[PDB]
Amino acid sequence: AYTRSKIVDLVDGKIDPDTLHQMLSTPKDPERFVTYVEILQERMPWDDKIILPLGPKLFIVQQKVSKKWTVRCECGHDFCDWKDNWKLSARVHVRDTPQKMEEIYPRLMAPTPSWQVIREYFCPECGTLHDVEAPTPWYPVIHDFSPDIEGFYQEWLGLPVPERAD
């Protein structure tokens, strides 16, 4: 239903309130995903197809030649195969002292790092912060999302699955 430029504004954080309320209060537009993902595609500097957005600067992607599925930054860096935790192949900054917590919180409003830690996760090439965790000491890294990509495209969207190698 929605105008294409209006779903762009929504991505750019610039959409008007009337259409923002319209989008929220009425049944969703079945066409959203295919318009959305195409909007993201034309904003990448690499022509490999996008399969699913993982964050603002993070995607599951289909290699134009090998047809493998991978996690990719917007800049270009492939982290891992899509069934793996990308964070395992990323770089991490751990805020575990009052000095580091007091860089992003005023004292007293910072968590205490013997109870809670800030783990920031960056792309190796561009330094982009794709995710920040707030667990305890010892706590494993978290595999956020394992999507059923086949069922989504095939059963919920009525679309062929993109070609896939291993």
Partner: protein, 710 residues
């Protein structure tokens, strides 16, 4: 011959309506373009138009008027479109933030069920007063007037100098619990007033205790800010009009319709009481009309030059909310429950540059009707321009043909702006705007009713915009109303409700009567004595103001009332006293018993908690004098076939991609009992009633029409 006694007025964004009532109830109605920069000019013109139908001069009539009621829309519009004044605020230091925090509430005020829970829907509007025009004084007064932190007067002098320097255009002062002890807030006000004198600037000051001395500081401050923000521009208007009229020989003081449906004096400095005066005019006329004809459940629908106003009259009464919200603002003044959407005959038709979708309004053209009027200088097309293209309006009968409306201007400006950017004909360009509006108004009216828990078939729909009879078919089609009525005087319907308004004065005094359940009959008579006194103190106030208006005490009918509650509560109930006099023990038992009774009805018999004891919180006194109310016609009904005299030819009328030659009828030349099959337009001097093909109307003995689906 004829003695003209009552005058009602709707000063609107487009037309200023006048409603004259004579001694026997007979009436006549005048229309004129508003002169919003000095509404006296349009008032005079409309008066002379209405009075000329009675072959009477404005001079001769004004000497005979005994009362008049003004209502309007200029202030309400200013609020809604946030076009008020650059106003600033001084509150208690350390709490400057409370205005802009909106008490959290105002991020979901007036939300339908579904959006109240849909969290991502909540949204804050801009604050009336931004943070850089707020300042704080160091003072603190507790819930019973004690000055815990005395006012450090220096901080008040810097507060004033700051906002004077910021070139604030009015300054509002709201200090906590000032309603209880206004000493500190009035010292601040005096200190501010002092600093504006030294500056040479013209900046008016508003102490909240001087205007709205009531608890809940977000409500009080919003309401007081309204006096600075929106009221001040139209403050000139009621003294310009009243001066122009006493100059001209009136012997009465004007009254104004106020938010609770009652009239107040034009002199009151609390103009915010009179903010929804125009719409409430319509609701009151529909209420009156219902009472004469036994319609107890009425849905009111008004379409003006700018918006579409809608309220429900449920079992003879309107609903009045105590601490209401309006335009997503908490307020301290009692309000009649209404609703609207911002579309009307002059709302501007624009296309989103990127979507190329039609957006109606929210602004309007007003007394300038649109492009169709050559001299209006209006370049953007308005819904009124689509009326001309489609054959809804008669080019040569706007205001009886006193106003030149050119259809080809409407056609060229519709083509260039709408039709050609959309690859449509001017016919389909205009018809799609009207069709969208028809559905938009219809879905709103259906939903306000659904929301309040009612079916549209439980109600009769009164329709009376002045431009609403142009879309009665539209927003009513298939809703299932019991009946849909277009009264013949639809165009001045609010000014009709204003001339119909009771001549009533009300007076209040608060109180501190605390009674346990078990009390001896001496504490019981003491309590009845002090309430008995307050009624007498109030009774002399009602009668003293009626004397200054030329009414002896014999003509005043008096109705005492009081406010009661269980002891520890926060809200109270108004109760009409069964006894005019109190005094003696058992009577205090009657007053409590009466309270209990209404508490059961208002809530539930098992809500009653007598063991908490009672608290009498105020006393009330009403004062009615008789007034000629407008007399509803009771004509003898005749044949269904209308006279050949009423036929005025045809116009090319375009609706569902079809052109038809729609009959034209002179409204006044129609007789009780006639029927009109669509397609036809019914025209008089200033009302156009549209009956498309697929509809039908008939006229009754009360000059009411009835829309049928058919």
């Amino acid at each position: 011959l004829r003695n003209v006694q009552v005058l009602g007025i709707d000063a609107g964004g487009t037309m200023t309506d006048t409603f004259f009532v004579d001694q026997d109830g007979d009436f006549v109605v005048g229309k004129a373009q508003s002169t919003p920069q000095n509404e006296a000019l349009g008032l005079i013109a409309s008066s002379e138009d209405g009075l000329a139908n009675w072959g009477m001069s404005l001079h001769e009539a004004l000497a005979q008027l005994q009362t008049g009621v003004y209502s309007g829309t200029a202030m309400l519009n200013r609020v809604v479109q946030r076009k008020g004044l650059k106003c600033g605020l001084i509150v208690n230091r350390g709490m400057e933030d409370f205005h802009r925090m909106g008490r959290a509430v105002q991020s979901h005020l007036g939300y339908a069920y579904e959006d109240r829970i849909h969290l991502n829907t909540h949204r804050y509007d801009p604050p009336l007063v931004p943070r850089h025009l707020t300042r704080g004084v160091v003072e603190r007064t507790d819930m019973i007037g004690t000055q815990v932190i005395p006012l450090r007067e220096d901080t008040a002098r810097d507060a004033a100098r700051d906002l004077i320097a910021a070139d604030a255009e009015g300054i509002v002062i709201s200090l906590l619990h000032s309603y209880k002890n206004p000493e500190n807030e009035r010292r601040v006000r005096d200190i501010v007033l002092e600093e504006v004198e030294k500056s040479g600037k013209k900046i008016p000051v508003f102490a909240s205790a001087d205007y709205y001395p009531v608890r809940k500081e977000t409500h009080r401050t919003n309401t007081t800010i309204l006096e600075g923000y929106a009221a001040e521009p139209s403050r000139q208007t009621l003294s310009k009009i009243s001066n122009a009229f006493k100059e001209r020989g009136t012997k009465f003081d004007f009254r104004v319709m106020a938010t609770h449906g009652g009239t107040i004096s034009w002199k009151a400095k609390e103009l915010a009481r009179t903010i929804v005066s125009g719409p409430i005019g319509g609701v009151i006329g529909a209420k009156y009309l219902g009472e004469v004809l036994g319609y107890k459940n009425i849905a009111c629908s008004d379409i003006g030059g700018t918006s579409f106003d809608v309220a429900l009259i449920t079992q003879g009464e309107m609903t009045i909310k105590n601490d209401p919200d309006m335009a997503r603002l908490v307020l301290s003044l009692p309000l009649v429950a209404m609703d609207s959407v911002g579309a009307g005959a002059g709302s501007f038709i624009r296309l989103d540059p990127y979507t190329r979708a039609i957006k109606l309004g929210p602004d309007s053209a007003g007394y300038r009707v649109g492009v169709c009027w050559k001299e209006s200088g209006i370049e953007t097309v308005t819904i009124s321009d689509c009326h001309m293209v489609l054959g809804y309006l008669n080019p040569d009968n706007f205001l009886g043909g006193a106003v030149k409306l050119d259809r080809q201007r409407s056609v060229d400006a519709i083509k260039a702006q709408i039709a050609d950017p959309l690859g449509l004909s001017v016919e389909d360009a205009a018809a799609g705007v009207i069709e969208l509006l028809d559905s938009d108004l219809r879905d709103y009216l259906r939903s306000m009713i659904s929301g309040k828990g009612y079916s549209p078939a439980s109600f009769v729909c009164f329709s009376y915009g002045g431009a609403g009879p142009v879309h009665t078919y539209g927003y009513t089609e298939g809703l299932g109303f019991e009946d849909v009525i277009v009264p013949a005087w639809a165009a001045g319907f609010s000014a009709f409700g204003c001339a119909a308004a009771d001549f009533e004065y009300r007076y209040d005094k608060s109180l501190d009567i605390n009674m346990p359940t078990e009390t001896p009959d001496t504490d019981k008579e003491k309590a009845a004595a002090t309430l008995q006194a307050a009624w007498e103190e109030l009774t002399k106030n009602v009668l003293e103001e009626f004397k200054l208006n030329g009414y002896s005490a014999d003509q005043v009918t008096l109705q005492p009332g009081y406010r009661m509650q269980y002891r520890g509560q926060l809200n109270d109930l108004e109760i009409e006293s069964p006894l005019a006099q109190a005094h003696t023990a058992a009577d205090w038992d009657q007053l409590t018993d009466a309270f209990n009774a209404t508490y059961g009805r208002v809530y539930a018999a098992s809500a009653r908690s007598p063991e908490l004891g009672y608290s009498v919180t105020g006393a009330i006194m009403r004062g009615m004098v008789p007034i000629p109310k407008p007399k509803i016609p009771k004509e003898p009904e005749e044949g269904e076939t209308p006279p050949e005299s009423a036929k005025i030819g045809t116009r090319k009328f375009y609706r569902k991609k079809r052109w038809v030659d729609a009959q034209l009828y002179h409204m006044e030349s129609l007789r009780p009992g006639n029927r009109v099959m669509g397609p036809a337009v019914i025209e008089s001097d200033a009302t156009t009633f549209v009956v498309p093909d697929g509809f039908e109307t008939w006229l009754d003995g009360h000059r009411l029409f009835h829309l049928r689906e058919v």
